[PDB]
Amino acid sequence: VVQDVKYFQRVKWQYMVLDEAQALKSSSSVRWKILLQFQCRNRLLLTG
DNA sequence: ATCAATATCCCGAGTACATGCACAGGATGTATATATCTGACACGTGCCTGGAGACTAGGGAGTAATCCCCTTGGCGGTTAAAACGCGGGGGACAGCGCGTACGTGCGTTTAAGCGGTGCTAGAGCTGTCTACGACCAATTGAGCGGCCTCGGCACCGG
């Protein structure tokens, strides 16, 4: 997703769920910023 | 936006070696005639180059974002240029002789002709079988992440 973020940017997304988000704990990482940059009205998580 | 100091061009005169023409001649260009095979002309032939159809898809044409190489401008250091004096070797004339071109004589050596015959060439279908297509598992390398240790600033102590 981070590498190919440009491909996802041109496509609109009705819903987004990012399972196993326990990795998304460091805001200094590129993953955090890239995930934040997506334009989606609703965000859902299933991280345990 | 000019005046001195050089350098160059123009013209005239004394001078000379090289151009241009005539002469004697000799050997190569020319006219005549013969032999003859190389190439013009005709014929058939069948290889293959040109035309069109349909389908696949690799490749080209069009667009957009952008980071990079291109170009302009500015400055410091120095490598070459311009002109002076100093110094040596290029440049201009006679004497030898050993090379190069003719002349003469000889024989070795290729061209030519005619049988003889292995021998390279072409299409034969021959069969293998390397090498071009497709797929797949090896290492190499960079972009990332987690954690630990070190160092600076704000807070409390004497």
Bases of strand B lying below 7 A from some protein CB: 144-146
Q: Distance (Å) from CA A14 to C1' B40? A: 90
As a residue count, chain A comes to 48
Look up residue A9 and give its two tokens: 């940017």
Kindly report the number of other CB atoms within 10 A of residue A21's CB atom.
Answer: 15
| Cα(A37)–Cα(A33) distance, integer angstroms | 6
| Resolution for the entry shown, Å | 3.2
Residues A30 and A19: beta-carbon distance below 8 Å: no
Residues A42 and A16: beta-carbon distance below 8 Å: yes
> What is the separation of C-alpha A24 from the centre of its chain, rounded to a whole number of angstroms?
9
Residues A45 and A24: beta-carbon distance below 8 Å: no
Q: Which residue is nearest to nucleotide B143 (CA to C1')?
A: A3
Q: Distance (Å) from CA A9 to C1' B84? A: 81
To 10 degrees, the CA torsion angle through A31, A35, A37, A38? Answer: 150
Residues A31 and A24: beta-carbon distance below 8 Å: yes
Nucleotide nearest to A28 (CA to C1'): B145
Alpha helices by DSSP H, A1-48: 5-9, 30-36
Write phi, then psi, for A32 (nearest 5 degrees). Answer: -55, -50
